Amino acid sequence: MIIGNNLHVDAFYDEATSTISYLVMDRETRQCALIDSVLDYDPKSGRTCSASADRLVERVNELNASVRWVLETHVHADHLSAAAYLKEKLGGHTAIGAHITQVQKVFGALFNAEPGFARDGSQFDVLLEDEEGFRIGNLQARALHTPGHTPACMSFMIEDAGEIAVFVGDTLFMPDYGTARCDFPGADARTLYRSIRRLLAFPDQTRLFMCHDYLPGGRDMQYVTTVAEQRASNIHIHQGIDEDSFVAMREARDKTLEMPVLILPSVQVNMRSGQLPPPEANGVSYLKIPLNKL
Amino acid sequence: MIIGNNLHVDAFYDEATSTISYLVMDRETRQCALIDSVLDYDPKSGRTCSASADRLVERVNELNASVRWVLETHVHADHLSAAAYLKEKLGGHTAIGAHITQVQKVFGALFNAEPGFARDGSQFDVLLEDEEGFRIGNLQARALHTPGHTPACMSFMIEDAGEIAVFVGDTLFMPDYGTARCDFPGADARTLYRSIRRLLAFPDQTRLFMCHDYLPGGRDMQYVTTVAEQRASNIHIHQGIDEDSFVAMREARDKTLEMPVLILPSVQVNMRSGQLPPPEANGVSYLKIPLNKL
Ligand SMILES: [Fe+3]
Ligand SMILES: [Fe+3]
Structure with missing residues (x-):
């Protein structure tokens, strides 16, 4: 896809984990960013x-690109991140939400991590805060704190011309599937509702890119939708659904969910x-x- | 099922791992043994x-029986053994092949066992040797060393009158499925052939009890066969199969096999x-x- 004029977006789908990875390049400087990479x-x-x-390394070299950012929307509990491998072969800076510290504190105790394990997010190059801007070449990007799925969930918005693209992570799915789960430690259904309403406050023609697509059909793989489409036809949180109705729905559904296969690793x-x-x-x-x- | 007059055998099937557990009770003394129990x-x-x-616990009480032995044919790599739980709930003595020490040396290193892990089979009450006899009440049993799947595989032979029952473990499957794998560390296809031939040297009327049934197609669970049936129609090692021809078949097939889901835990x-x-x-x-x- 090419949004605006110089926003180049490539999508990568891993069937095993249903995870959608992204390559986001500024066409003017041929400088890019890698979001939510999968480590098999x-x-x-x-x-x-x-x-x-x-598959990402080849796509970068094919476009004569240069990795500037290696982004992660949140601490994935369904697959392993390939951020370290990609930085070791393509370079750049890793980035994640500032509330990684809260996640490291909890699971640092759950796995009884060695005393050398850092709880300050020292493993990540940059700790992003809410409404904080960062540059992908000439593309102006911002990091948005959108908790609910996890306490450290971030969404990346990127602007070119008058059009906006937002990478929402595990918050919204395609309108036919609904929203993400809130049964993980630190997760909250009421917080997720607010983060999404805040996300859907963007212009209705804003392109939204999904983190997963479990294919409710039937249908093929889809990764991109709009704000207007979500507000009108989302089966879980369309415009007609208030806060209280969503929470009762979301919490009742989380109790009927099994744990991800690879959550502990x-x-x-x-x-x-x-x-x-x-x-x-x-x-x-x-x-x-x-x-x-x- | 009852073999002879005083040999009571109850088979149990775990759908998840296709594992067949057994309850072997002496009718007179009302004493029993438990073979290859599954911990979910x-x-x-x-x-x-x-x-x-x-389900094994309540079955024992239903028969008003007494547990004397809690047996394992070999160290399973497809499910967790519930020998410890049943020993704390029903009592008795746990027993396993004497070559348990070999697999404890290898996997003691692979899992980097903590200082205190014994590699001499000390965790098991009784280490059984080849052609060693033991008693389940008045029933005379005998342990046979039948390696090939693992270096410590044992087969349990029990006599009544009259007729012979043998619990072969992971050596022979049902004649329509063949034999066990030999890719696990310590296994050898040629020596498995030799172990099976010893088993098929028993009287043709001797009943054989399987450890697994993976349901070739869809024909319901089957756990019992005879020596004559195996010698005449086993797709892998019937009477007409030479040693060299089996090794080439077995070792080629193991190269096309994935690891069991629960092999490491x-x-x-x-x-x-x-x-x-x-x-x-x-x-x-x-x-x-x-x-x-x-
Ligand atoms: Fe997630
Ligand atoms: Fe086995």
């Missing part, structure tokens, strides 16, 4: 693979900015799986 | 459950006689998952 991982054998990550890796836990005496890195907790 | 485990949330195990638990890893300082037990080492 098999829970059975405990083996990683940069198969999907290399994902968080302990994504809280380290995509770094594997440090090797033990035998030089082997291990993922700690808490028993009968969570 | 959810890898997504790290939650254990004794729903299947309690099961082994590190089953090598502790069904006991979970000792809690850390925060009072939480953790399963170590080795990364890129399998």
Whole structure:
């Protein structure tokens, strides 16, 4: 897609985790950003693979690009982040919400992390705050704090000409599927409602890019929608739904949800900015799986 | 099912792992043994459950029976053993093959076991040897060393009158499915062939009890067959199959197999006689998952 004049957006879909990754480039400077990259991982054998990550490396080189930002909307609990691998091969700066510290505090205790594990977000280059601006070449971008799914959820808006594109993360899905879950630690259905209403306050022709697409059909994969479409036909939080009705709906639905397959391996890796836990005496890195907790 | 006159056998099926558990009771003395019990485990949330195990508990009380043995044919790599739970609930003695020490040495290193983990099979009450006899009430049983799937695989032979019943474990499946795999560390296809031939040297009327039934197509669960049926129609190792021809078949097939879903959490638990890893300082037990080492 090309929004406005110089906003270039490439979408990448991982069927295994239903995760949509993004390559966002300024066409004027050929300088780009990578959002929510997927690190392939098999829970059975405990083996990683940069198969999907290399799809981004090829796309960058094909466009003669230059990575400036490696972004993450939130601490993913459904897949492993490939932010560290991409920074090691394409360079740039990693960035995540400032409230990563709250997440690191909780799961730092759940996994009984080694004393060397930082709870200040030292693993991430830049800690973004609400309404904070940052530059992708000539493209003016802003980081928006939109909690609900997690306490540290951020949304990235990028402007070119008069048109706006917002990368919302795990807040809104396609209008036919609804919204994200709020059964994770720190999550809140009432907070999510407010973050979305604030998101839908944007101009109605604002393009919204999704983090997941579970395909309610039937239909193929879709990643882009508009504010006007969401306000009119979202099955969970369209314009007719007030705060109280959403919360009762959202909370009742979360109780009927199963845990993500890779939630325990994902968080302990994504809280380290995509770094594997440090090797033990035998030089082997291990993922700690808490028993009968969570 | 009743073999001979005083041999009572109850089969139990776990849909998730296709595992077949057994309750073997002596009718006269009303004493019994439990073979390959399953401890329900959810890898997504790290939650254990004794729903299947309690089905064994209430079945014993229904028969007003007494548990003397809690057996395991080998260290399972597809499910968690519920031997410890059943021993704390029903009593008795746990027993396993003497070559448990070999698999505790290898996986004791793979999972980097904490200082205190015994690699001599000390966690098990009795270490069984080849052709060693033991008693379930008045029933004379005998343990046979039948490796190939694992270096410590045992088959349990029990006599009544008259007729012979053998619990082969993971060696022979139903004749329409063939044999077990030999890609697991310590396994060998040629030696498995030899173990099976020993088993098929028994009288043709001898009943064989399987450890798994993966349902080729859809024909309901089947756990019992005969030596004559296996010798005549086993798709992998019937009478007309030479040793060299089997090894080439078996080793080629194992290269086309994925790891079991629960292979990493099961082994590190089953090598502790069904006991979970000792809690850390925060009072939480953790399963170590080795990364890129399998
Ligand atoms: Fe998420
Ligand atoms: Fe097995």
